[PDB]
Design a protein around this ligand. Sequence first.
Ligand SMILES: Nc1nc2c(ncn2[C@H]2C[C@H](O)[C@@H](COP(=O)(O)OP(=O)(O)OP(=O)(O)O)O2)c(=O)[nH]1
Ligand SMILES: [Mg+2]
Ligand SMILES: [Mg+2]
Ligand SMILES: [Mg+2]
Ligand SMILES: [Zn+2]
Length: 994
Amino acid sequence: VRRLETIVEEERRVVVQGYVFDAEVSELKSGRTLLTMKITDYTNSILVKMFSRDKEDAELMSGVKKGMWVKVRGSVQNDTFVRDLVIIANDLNEIAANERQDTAPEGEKRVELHLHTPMSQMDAVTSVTKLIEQAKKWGHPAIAVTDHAVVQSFPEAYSAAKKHGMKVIYGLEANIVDDPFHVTLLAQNETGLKNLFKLVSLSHIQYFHRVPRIPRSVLVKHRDGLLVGSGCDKGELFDNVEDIARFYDFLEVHPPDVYKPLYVKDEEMIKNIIRSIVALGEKLDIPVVATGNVHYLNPEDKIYRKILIHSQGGANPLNRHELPDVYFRTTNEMLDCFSFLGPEKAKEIVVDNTQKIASLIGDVKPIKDELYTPRIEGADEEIREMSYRRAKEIYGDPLPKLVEERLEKELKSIIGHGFAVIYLISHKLVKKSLDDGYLVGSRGSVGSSFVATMTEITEVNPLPPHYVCPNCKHSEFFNDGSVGSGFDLPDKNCPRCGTKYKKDGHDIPFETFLGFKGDKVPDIDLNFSGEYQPRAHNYTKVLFGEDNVYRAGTIGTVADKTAYGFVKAYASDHNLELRGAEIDRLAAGCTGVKRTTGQHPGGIIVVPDYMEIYDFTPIQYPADDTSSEWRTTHFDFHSIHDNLLKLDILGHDDPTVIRMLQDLSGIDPKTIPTDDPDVMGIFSSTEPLGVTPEQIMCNVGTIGIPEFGTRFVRQMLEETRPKTFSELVQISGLSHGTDVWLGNAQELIQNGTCTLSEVIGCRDDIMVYLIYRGLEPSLAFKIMESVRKGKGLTPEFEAEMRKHDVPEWYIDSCKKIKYMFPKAHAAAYVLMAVRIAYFKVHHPLLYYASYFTVRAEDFDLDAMIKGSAAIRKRIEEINAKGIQATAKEKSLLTVLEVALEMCERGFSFKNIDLYRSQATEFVIDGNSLIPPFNAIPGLGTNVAQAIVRAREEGEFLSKEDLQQRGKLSKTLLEYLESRGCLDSLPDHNQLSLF
DNA sequence: GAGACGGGCAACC
DNA sequence: ATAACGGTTGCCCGTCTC
Ligand SMILES: Nc1nc2c(ncn2[C@H]2C[C@H](O)[C@@H](COP(=O)(O)OP(=O)(O)OP(=O)(O)O)O2)c(=O)[nH]1
Ligand SMILES: [Mg+2]
Ligand SMILES: [Mg+2]
Ligand SMILES: [Mg+2]
Ligand SMILES: [Zn+2]
């Protein structure tokens, strides 16, 4: 039985063992099945191939899964397609993982009091969930979590404590400075837990130096509910009398091996230092505990950490020397390590005292169960009058029954579950943005709420389709279900006052937002312009008070691309030539480790005034930047999703684009029609653009249109040809999410199994259909919510579906969908698409200026200026690279597509112009666009803005004058000069005056 | 060596 | 061409310049 590190060349025959971390099965022309696995015994890894000789072995092959251990016998061959040695297996047997066993007797087990998770930035490697499982299996009565300076593993630890029935001790390894050394904090109770949250907050904010730290006095202030430990070799006492020590409730000592970095003479000195501490805890009646300082599960997991640390260069200084063995140690093996102090002391400090400390810890719940909802005087009642007054002024007094009932039902739910405040705050945020000159785009599931329509938090009106007279208030509603959206109606006059009817209503059920029980916590989503987002953000400090809102924080972890990067460099720097399969496994062992912190892209977390942020999470600065305008949550929004309401104040280009489209045409985009035949025609043809498909390398007219302009969506449009608002809404829905169209709805339509309109194209339809079919609404809602998060179906859901005659293809279709819009989102985004489309057709140059000004960031200006044929040449170059195209080539391709179409429509791009070019805005001149300075590679907004500033306060008098005052590098100056831009100026002036 | 700038990446809606 | 979810903010780090 050969270890995988010993497999180095072709070889007739070997037997080998290992963990299967990947397995795929495929079918050969011959009939035969091939099994392709990767295995690692943790000394190395290898790719294994097996070719079935019969259908029995073929199906067994299908049963080999990740997580299995396997003994394989076979030959070692160079495989030239994989460019690596590989095992061709004749024989395969599943085996036991037979991992480290804990042999002490039940009741007499160890507790680990000092342990690091992947949240110990770039320092630890095994998820807290796996450590917690291991402790449970080894029968440890508890296990502690004590990451460095942070408590970010708490939420996962909790979950795993619950799933596994393990008692977790919530802690912190902290940096204490005297008023810089490590201590261990263990929370005994909720007072202790809250003090932990305060300590991490203070250490990250008031007391952050170059690293989070806690003055000893501030620790004492916040010591209640915490047992304090001395600990490490970076401990206070280990680095040396009794005074220091009497400060601690427990005294830490690590296995002798752990201190092997040696500051010391030999192993006999360390053994004795440990023995001083043993004398010293006994003399002072302080429990001495054998803790492990865990940084990974098993001895061999060491390698992953070694790789992470190595990625930090001489900036780390732990690369100065070999890393200590700090794996999770069994209780019997912890005794072995401490055998020298004899059988009684071994046993005392490894199990009795370790166990005793655990007994001093209660049952702490680090994350709460319920939602805490804000109160602001007048809010419930103001939302009521706002919505009734506004509905009356549109639908009349008294209200039609339909409207009356939607209001009464909606308002008692919003109010009762405590959402009236955020509706109102959302109203003021939108109103201020408008007053400040920035329109706001609608988003997400609040469009499902007519009260939200009435409070001007969404432009989506969810009532059934209908006409309403803007003058006399008369209405007609259609509940036939025959009409998809009011926007689909034919123009019609009020048969009472004569006037032109308004059309509206997308038939969206309120429950998509709050559900039936009101036991779901949605947010409110708003698309503000990216320019304005920060100001919307700051307005929430004014509304709620500076200390009752916090920007949601994020944790930056190592994902695949970074892991593979780290592993290769480590391989390279060490002159290792590794097999693909071994690079993969080292890669996989690095993922999940925290590397940074950051900012949610827009969520503001609201704290009720009768609670405090520390009831929920610590706070800090994103990336630890002490000049940040905003503090962040220490936990990410996902951990506290159900505890506090969130305002998703997002940034987006759509609102900015149509704002500039309006500031340029004078056209009020609210007046744009949603059934203009030429505008709607671009969703299925190039006709309305006045160019050929061959001219613009595209069969539909949606180039540049948000969402619909993509290569995938264009193709869907080619084959679905929508003409109607609700048809566009249907395809918005099926174009967003994996396994929604491809392999699913597409096959269903091409099969004849259902029609385009019957395919599942928003989450709402699932619910609405299941109710129709006879399921209990709240269950239909549950099922909708499960599938739109790509969680598929439970046996109970399927059985409820079947028993009400839901067909097998619909159920199977639910199981595919990985993600899915709510209708109100699709309708919001489509409405914006159509507004912009209107300009694409009727005011083309305005459309292009706004496109290149607001959205584009990657240009080939020389190509663009030469024009049509040159642009096409570049696009073909990028097309040729296929999916081997870099993210950046794709961004360029996207913009060149719209430039080529611009050119074919008869327009063009002029060179940079010293006196007519602007800073960041593409400006209109006749039938052209004069590109702005920031379009130049290397020339950013700043220089762009300076160049414009300087010329406004005095023309340029030489190329030198332009360089000095325009703040231009030599390279940028050459860029202009070589394209003829500076030809009218002398190189320098022979005169200068003040 | 301080600081724009852009690429590459991760988190999130 | 293939297959294909689209679009946004934010953080780190190597490069190029002065
Ligand atoms: N294309 C795409 N859009 C998304 C995705 N996730 C969210 N969005 C868009 C569509 C959603 O309606 C909105 C997401 O906002 P939320 O995360 O607040 O969810 P939503 O409002 O749909 O449900 P909620 O009631 O808030 O739980 O933004 C996604 O994975 N892909
Ligand atoms: Mg330490
Ligand atoms: Mg430690
Ligand atoms: Mg939402
Ligand atoms: Zn009328």
